[PDB]
Amino acid sequence: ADAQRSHYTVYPSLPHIPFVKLLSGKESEVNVEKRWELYHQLHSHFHDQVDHIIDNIEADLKAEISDLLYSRCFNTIFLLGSDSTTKIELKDESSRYNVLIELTPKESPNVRMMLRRSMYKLYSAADAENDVSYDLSLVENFKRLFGKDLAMVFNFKDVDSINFNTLDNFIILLKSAFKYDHVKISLIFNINTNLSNIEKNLRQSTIRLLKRNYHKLDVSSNKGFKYGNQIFQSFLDTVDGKLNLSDRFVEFILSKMANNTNHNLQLLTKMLDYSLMSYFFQNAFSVFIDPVNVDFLNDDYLKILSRCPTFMFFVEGLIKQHAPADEILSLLLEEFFVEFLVRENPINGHAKFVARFLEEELNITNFNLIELYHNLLIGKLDSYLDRWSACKEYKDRLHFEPIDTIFQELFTLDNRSGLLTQSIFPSYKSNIEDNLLSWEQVLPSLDSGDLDKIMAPVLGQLFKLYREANMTINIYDFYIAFRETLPKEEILNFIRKDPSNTKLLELAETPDAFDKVALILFMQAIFAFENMGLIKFQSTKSYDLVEKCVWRGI
Amino acid sequence: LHTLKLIATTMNKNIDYLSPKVRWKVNVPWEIIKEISESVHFNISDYFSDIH
Amino acid sequence: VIRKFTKKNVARAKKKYTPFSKRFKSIAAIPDLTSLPEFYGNSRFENKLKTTQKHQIVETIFSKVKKQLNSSYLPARENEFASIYLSAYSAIESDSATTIYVAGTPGVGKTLTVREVVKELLSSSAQREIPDFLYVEINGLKMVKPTDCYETLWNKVSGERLTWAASMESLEFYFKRVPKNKKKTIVVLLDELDAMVTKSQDIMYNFFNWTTYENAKLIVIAVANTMDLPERQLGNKITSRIGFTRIMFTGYTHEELKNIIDLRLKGLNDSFFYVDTKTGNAILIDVRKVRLRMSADAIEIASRKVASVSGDARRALKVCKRAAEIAEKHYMAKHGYGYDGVQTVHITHVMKALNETLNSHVITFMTRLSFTAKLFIYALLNLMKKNGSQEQELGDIVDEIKLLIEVNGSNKFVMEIAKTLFQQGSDNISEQLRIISWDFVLNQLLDAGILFKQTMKNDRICCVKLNISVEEAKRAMNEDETLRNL
DNA sequence: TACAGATTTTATGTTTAGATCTTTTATGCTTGCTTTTCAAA
DNA sequence: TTTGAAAAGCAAGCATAAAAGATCTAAACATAAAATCTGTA
Ligand SMILES: Nc1ncnc2c1ncn2[C@@H]1O[C@H](COP(=O)(O)OP(=O)(O)OP(=O)(O)O)[C@@H](O)[C@H]1O
Ligand SMILES: [Mg+2]
Q1: What else is known (chain B)?
Q2: Which residue blocks in A345-457 are alpha helix, DSSP H?
Q3: CB neighbours of residue A95 within 10 Å
Q4: Alpha-carbon gap, residue A221 to A80, rounded angstroms
């Protein structure tokens, strides 16, 4: 059986886009394909800029490491917030081999393996452009074998993960190469936590050795917000003139971006991407971000767009300002819808204007463009600009009031349904607890109908008694409590419904029938709880008591 | 926090994260957690002043 | 190509990989292996160890007794000889395959009587009473690897040199598919079978399984030191399936050992010798005629002591040789003889030769140690008398030594020796935490095997135990005139 | 057949991933006494 | 406003889980000489 196997490949039997028909299925397939292709050009336009930004991050970061790496001691570079993914380049410097050595904690169980891997990589790199011993006498004999001087650049990856005694002994080992006049050694430390956590794990003589020339480099993407602002601006120029961004959405972006520090840019890209997929999958008005689809107006579009609250406010203001009733009933529209979807919405260009004015005209760099865009959305840009004590004279030039335009609710990115929360950052164990406790929000209540009506599913019934119990539960008392909730008569009628099964009918007329059925269902639900991680047997060979492990609402 | 070893476990290799037998402990000194608590303006010393 | 490590001293034998199942096209294509000059065996290193002597050896009257009591030179093993001989003879004359398992303690004459059975079988085959056979001797304690037996036996069968797995498949195909009229009978002595079965039971099961084949013509004699070796290496189902002959070899009694010794000495006791009086050379018959004897009670008590302890012939022969050597040492020292009326080997010589085996040197070694080493052992004995733990921390021994020095200040010896123990008799040396030669005597008692020390880098909490017993230590420290009164 | 070259076989060394058992220490249960807040008069 | 009394606290003793590691095995990774198999010649 394949179900009892470790793994197996199924060559399915083959007996065209995932977008569905909206407007209760009355949308045309032409509009579905146009939504598909529209989403693809928006996604391509965003992601080309994102790829260019990521490539520029790589190029500038290699440039900074190459500048710091060049121009009788170690040359020490500390890369703070590195995550150790960058490929470090060394130049071509004549009459000198520049050899770069990567070491991970998995490649470093002891000092011997560090030296053997380092000298194997050194000998292989020197031969690439008679066997030898992979030890430090390769370093002292390097000019005798290859004729040129040696420059070793050690790159320790994930320094917060390597055993620090091994790393200390390896640095003390590499100190022995200082007596050779043809060797210089550079060390690169990929620090993730901070420098004070590193020097409390190293010995003081090693710190005194490393203090002769060291350079700190904040290599995080959070420093200065220079790369997050380019990604957010690329998303803004993708959706400029087509889609709006809500203050709820930008506040959600900021709140989720604060909770992750080492991986911020691709979380932002994932959130913006999923919002774009959700909008282009749920909204039939997406075809109207292109002006060539204005002849595709039908009835269902009009009754969907007539429920906009901006339209509601506009027509009640119209009955406030216009006394006669004949002009009001004429609007209650197709021609009025077209003339307002071609508005410029200059908040994106003005956000770019204040961004370049803050960066290149006031020499202020420590601003978040996402936070600035949120403050421009809520109308408090002055309360964001009154911090640096230099925008006081420019307070009146950068003024902007928000314009709540008509029919912007059909073209916006929001989160008022919690879909972005349920899909990207769910309350996983809370959802499991709430599905176990309630269960009528999962299984439908259709109106064995009687036993389905008056008896709960077994896992939810067990969880209702689990939650109200103490930390330590007696299993037999738990089974006694579970048996009281069950119907003693309707269950015995339920197992007699099928006359074809004869052994169950034989077991049904036993005087100990209902307790056996209750114990079987109880034991199956108890092992389901044990596999989920809800309970734990606090023993090995008795299995008489269990301990509660999970509490709802934590 | 576990992969940075600011938190540690009772076992170090082939770690069963989902087992209830595996327990957790802090792996920072008092000075590090003190400056972390002052970074977030949390009164961590108030939970230790009355105990000793 | 840049290598990750090198193996520069690989010496590989020129052994082929193709087994005997592919030497011929079919089972009917195999010729008569008896009529082949490489099959069934159809030593050039002696002249390396050759030289010429210049001076004649002086062969003393006791050197005949010494040379004639060597293990290199079958009373009491007649039922065992009869059993092995009739099993092997009945299986050879019926062209069958059998296996005889022989067990026993070392030195009871197992290999000797199996070899004597084999030579008697060879002599009977020389008289054409039974068909001819090959004799192969495989010793499990004479190998680098246990699988080399597969390499050896096939090399004695076919004459070719294969690797061990190919040799195993070759031997399987030989004993299974080769017909009986095209092959010869093989008698294998599997000596030291516990040496070849330690890693796994493949060699045991293969050699016993080959005797179950109807085409095998194989006699396997397997000699071991325990009886339950087939019962614990193979299961009872397998050992019931083969059905080997089971023979035990009990140790010799004292009368049997006595007959062994004077059968080694049958032509020498109460015999005459022409002895050169100026050199000591003796010739069996300026020259004196000397009779030579060993008394009966000396051999009697030697064979009585050996049969109580081990019962093997090697120990009895060796204590007789050692007694003769002691007698010849005193004889050569008395007469001033060189290397190039009645002479007897007495009861006292056998007594002394037995006493070298019987006595232990532990007490004698401990009574001749220095004061610091005896101080260490005395402090250790005091600590196991006080707390009764049998393992004492080294810091407790240090404090007990310090307390024993500080308490006995009125003693003349301790007052005279304390400046030596804590300052090496010098006023420029500060008072030391350890005594002088502390680690020296600790290492010496660890090297002698008197002590055991656990592996711990904290020198204070590290524990030390006596590795001998407490009574030899008590007897050693009560001998010393300094320690026994304090 | 001949023979250079490629592949297999046999043999062994290097490094890592994990299992089992032993020794010492943490941890939870039991039982009897002492302090302390909250439900009730 | 008391009050009293059951919940909470605490500690000595002890059986047991579990941490730390000593010791070891086996699989992945690696090399290498002799024999053996392939493709032309
Ligand atoms: N019955 C005997 N008669 C004479 N000499 C004997 C006898 N038994 C043993 N010896 C002597 O003692 C030696 C030891 O005998 P043998 O090698 O047969 O012992 P074993 O039982 O095979 O010992 P191990 O288990 O040590 O190999 C023989 O070589 C021989 O010199
Ligand atoms: Mg023997």
Answers
A1: Present with 768 molecules/cell in log phase SD medium.
A2: 347-360, 369-378, 382-385, 419-424, 428-437, 449-454
A3: 7
A4: 11
Residue of A nearest to C4 (CA): A120
Matching residue, tokens 């419904």? A497
Q: What is the resolution of this structure in A?
A: 2.6
Rounded Cα distance, A140 and A63, in Å = 31
What's the token pair of residue C20? 């005997």
For the Cβ of C318 lying below 6 angstroms from any atom of ligand 1, the answer is no
Separation of alpha carbons A243 and A347, rounded Å: 12
Please tell me the distance from the alpha carbon of residue A57 to that of residue A221, in angstroms, as a whole number. 9
* Buried-exposed string A34-63: b where 16+ CB fall within 10 A, e elsewhere: bbeebbeebeeebeebbeebbeebeeebee
Whole-angstrom distance, CA of residue A451 vs CA of residue C258: 97
Residue at token pair 């050197």: C63
- Window C126-145, strand D contacts by Cβ < 7 Å: 145
Is there a contact between A156 and A189 (Cβ–Cβ < 8 Å)? yes
What does C85-124 look like in DSSP terms, one character per residue?
Answer: HHHHHHHHHTT--EEEEEEE-TTSSHHHHHHHHHHHHHHH
Angle made by CA atoms B25, B26, B27, in degrees to the nearest 5: 120
Alpha carbons within 13 angstroms on the beta-carbon side of residue A200 total 12
Q: Which residues contact A349 (CB under 8 A, 6 or more apart)?
A: A240
- Decide: C77 in ligand 1 pocket, CB within 6 A: yes
Q: Does C28 touch chain A (CB under 8 A)?
A: no
- Cβ–Cβ gap A131/C4 under 8 Å: no
Q: Cβ of C458 < 7 Å from strand E?
A: no
DSSP element (H, E) containing C135: strand C133-139
Q: Is the CB of C454 under 7 A from strand E?
A: no
User: Residue A104, SS3?
Assistant: coil
Chain D positions with a protein C-beta closer than 7 Å = 9-19, 29
DSSP code of residue C266: T
- Interface check for B12 against chain A (CB to CB < 8 A): the answer is no
Residue C257's CB is within 10 A of a number of other CB atoms, namely 27
Neighbour count for residue C107 (Cβ, 10 Å): 22
The Cα–Cα gap between A469 and A465 comes to 6
Which phi and psi angles does C290 have, rounded to 5°? -120, 130
Count Cβ atoms within 10 A of the Cβ of residue C189 and give its class: 0-12 exposed, 13-18 middle, 19 or more buried: buried
Please choose, from the candidates C415, C310, C395, C396, the residue with its C-alpha nearest in 3D space to the C-alpha of residue C358: C310
Q: What SS3 string covers A309-358? A: HHHHHHHHHHHHHCCCCHHHHHHCCHHHHHCCCCCCCCHHHHHHHHHHHH
Whether B18 and chain A come into contact, CB under 8 Å, resolves to yes
With H, G, I as helix, E, B as strand and everything else as coil, classify residue C153: helix
Q: Cβ neighbours of residue C131 under 8 Å, at least 6 residues apart?
A: C92, C93, C95, C125, C184, C185
**Cβ pair C211, C88 in contact under 8 A:** no
Backbone angles phi, psi at C430, to 5 degrees: -70, 165
Tokens of A112: 């011997």
The DSSP annotation for A187-235 comes to EEEEESS-HHHHHTTS-HHHHHHHTSSEEEEE--SSGGGHHHHHHHHHH
Contact A303, A284 (CB under 8 A): no
Of C301, C297, C295, C322, the C-alpha closest to C254 is C301
- Say yes or no for a CB contact (<8 Å) between A123 and C2: yes
State both tokens at C27.
Answer: 């089972």
> Is any atom of ligand 1 closer than 6 Å to the C-beta of C76?
yes
Q: Technique behind this structure?
A: cryo-EM
Q: How far is the CA of C108 from the centre of ligand 1 (A)?
A: 5
| Tokens describing residue A470 | 């103490």
Q: Which of C485, C376, C392 is nearest to C434 (CA)?
A: C376
And the tokens for C61?
Answer: 């009257």
Using CB atoms within 10 A of its CB, is residue A542 exposed (0-12), middle (13-18) or buried (19+)?
exposed
